[PDB]
Amino acid sequence: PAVRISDGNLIIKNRTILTGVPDNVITTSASEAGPVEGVFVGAVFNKEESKHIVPIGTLRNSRFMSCFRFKLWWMAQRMGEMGRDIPYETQFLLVESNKVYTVFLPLIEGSFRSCLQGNVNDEVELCLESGDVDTKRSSFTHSLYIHAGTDPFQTITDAIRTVKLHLNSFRQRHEKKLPGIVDYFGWCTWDAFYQEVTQEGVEAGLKSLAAGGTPPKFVIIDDGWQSVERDPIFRLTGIKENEKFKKKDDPNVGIKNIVKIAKEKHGLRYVYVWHAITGYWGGVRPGEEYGSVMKYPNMSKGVVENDPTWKTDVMTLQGLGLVSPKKVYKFYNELHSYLADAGVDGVKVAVQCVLETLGGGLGGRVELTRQFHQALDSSVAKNFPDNGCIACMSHNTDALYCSKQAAVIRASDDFYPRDPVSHTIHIASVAYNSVFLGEFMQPDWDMFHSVHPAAEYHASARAISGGPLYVSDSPGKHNFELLRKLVLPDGSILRARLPGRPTRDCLFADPARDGVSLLKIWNMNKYTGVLGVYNCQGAAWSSTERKNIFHQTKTDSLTGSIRGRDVHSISEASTDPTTWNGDCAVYSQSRGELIVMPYNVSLPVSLKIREHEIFTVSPISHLVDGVSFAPIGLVNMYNSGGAIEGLRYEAEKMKVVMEVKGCGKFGSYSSVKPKRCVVESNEIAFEYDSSSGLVTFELDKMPIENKRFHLIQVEL
């Protein structure tokens, strides 16, 4: 049966993973399916309670990785090998047996949500909570799912899918419609003006970016456009824009003014706006219209253990006007109808995890979350039918397991331009949280600044994230040399196809805390892989201080290495995987060096703290003995291989035929010097380094007219 409890142990393919499983912990393999590869786990208790905790078993001497909420809104990573190091509010746990990987997914069941936490005795406890004193249960059968396999990424995905088939209450990332903003450069007003944003500031930012040749095609009008008032917390007073967004003649005209300027005058395709899941930070001003009533956040133990300041946050103490569940659809619809009729294409929806703290006597955290998201999704589908929703501050399983439609999720805590501790931590967080969040939605690695000491560090990460790419530059503060590595002259980006994630290598070694390893992040394009390597040692969240701090490091520089197969799915980029020997052409985007890397050969990589390097990794095709080739792409862009749309080898003609998007310097590996390089039927000059095999030529202009991609032929 693979995964079983017998004696009082949890045994996984004949390895004891946990010992000392209580008698009252019960397992099953039924569901809709119903027979299922892993096991659902639950428990039976003596009394009704609105909260239970129960040990599942004792964990020692097995490497784990977990994603845990260090704050209400957000996860980060913690590695370890003893149950006692498992954090409070662990939402995802992956265990290694030394070859075999086991995932533990704590679930929502009925009105309860579960997570895991470690205790002093090295037990893994499941914590089940309804968040409502009137909602009480005593037995549970599907509050946790455990599944094992030999490919850690495949293991995760198969488990999520099994759970989906059981709950039917979410979709997987790959089944959802991504909104069109993901394929374009954007700009977000948040770090540029904070709440003092005005419509003139919006226009200024768009114009400055476009004037340097990297034009955004979406904008996020972030927090500060809405009509809010104090009663020191602010609450929503109406659904329309404030005075800063009213045309300065004609104050009857509203946010439609800036939207039309953006799109007709500056060429934007999309405009999004920010709002809280509750309207604003303090909710909506109490009243009949939407049934808003003052409510005060309930504290749960796990959240407040990791985040003690939450007990004295302004939202906790001054409360929120919570719109009624009976009127929530109407609130979202009236807000979104106003927005859509003004030309707005989507919303960035923040403050999402507050609902779990307000389910009071409304059925609790799960039911309240489900209700609000049901209404929000209906409103988004009606009013922003490109699927215009970015989920923000939303890392709770209550929202993840009801993620049926929305397709983009902020993968971490905010970019912080002025906080030096944050940069290394940001890269670790987005990468590790993406392992799990990217099963539900496309991860958004957040805005950044192009003029900043960490700009390249952040920029390169976004380029391999698989997610939307956007800066929050103040108008005029741009580095366009850096932005041209991310954005083409029409505002399109080279987006990779998957959530960027750590390599198998990096899943159980904490590169923020171990003092010894470099973080390596992989993604895929259609005909190449990509790999970024980061030193992010020297800072992380503190179990003792309970916030992000710097910590001692043994040295500045670390040396690790890369292999072609670190790009876990690199196979899928090969045009003939069954004959492929595993050799890759590896192009260092930062050094500009092409290296041939045979299957399993390592290359050493050395980096100091806050340094990085990006490598495009392309499968080599052996056309005949001595004639071998791999495309690289737009070598002056971070995610070079994202430019290759089509690739075909004709060994009988010793030819390669490609479809390439974009413009700039194009590169490929060839063992031999080409006879000819042809672009749309004309022959063009090229360079060839005989020593590395690097072929380069210039793609002068974007494709015009009926072309849409450059058609390139390379004759060898």
Residue numbers in the entry: 5 to 102, 120 to 252, 265 to 749
Paper quotes:
The alkaline α-galactosidase AtAkαGal3 from Arabidopsis thaliana catalyzes the hydrolysis of α-d-galactose from galacto-oligosaccharides under alkaline conditions. Here, thin-layer chromatography is used to demonstrate that AtAkαGal3 exhibits a dual function and is capable of synthesizing stachyose using raffinose, instead of galactinol, as the galactose donor. The structure of AtAkαGal3 comprises three domains: an N-terminal domain with 13 antiparallel β-strands, a catalytic domain with an (α/β)8-barrel fold and a C-terminal domain composed of β-sheets that form two Greek-key motifs. A sequence comparison of AtAkαGal3 with acidic α-galactosidases further confirmed that Asp383 and Asp447 are presumably critical residues that serve as the nucleophile and the catalytic acid/base, respectively.
Interestingly, superposition of the two galactose moieties at the catalytic binding sites of the wild-type AtAkαGal3–galactose and D383A–galactose complex structures shows that the galactose moiety in the D383A mutant exhibits a chair form with a slight distortion; the O1 hydroxyl group at the C1 carbon is in an α-anomeric form. This particular structural form thus places the O1 hydroxyl group of the galactose in a position nearer the OD2 group of Asp447 to form a direct hydrogen-bond interaction with a distance of 2.87 Å. Except for O1 at the anomeric C atom, which exhibits a conformational alteration from a β-form to an α-form, the positions of the remaining C atoms and hydroxyl groups of galactose are conserved and make unchanged interactions around the catalytic site compared with the wild-type enzyme. In the D383A structure, two additional water molecules interacting with O1 and O6 of galactose help to stabilize the galactose moiety compared with the wild-type AtAkαGal3 structure. To confirm that these two residues, Asp383 and Asp447 in AtAkαGal3, play important roles in catalysis, we generated two single mutants D383A and D447A by replacing Asp383 and Asp447 with alanine by site-directed mutagenesis. The TLC results showed that the hydrolase activity of both mutants towards raffinose was abolished (data not shown).
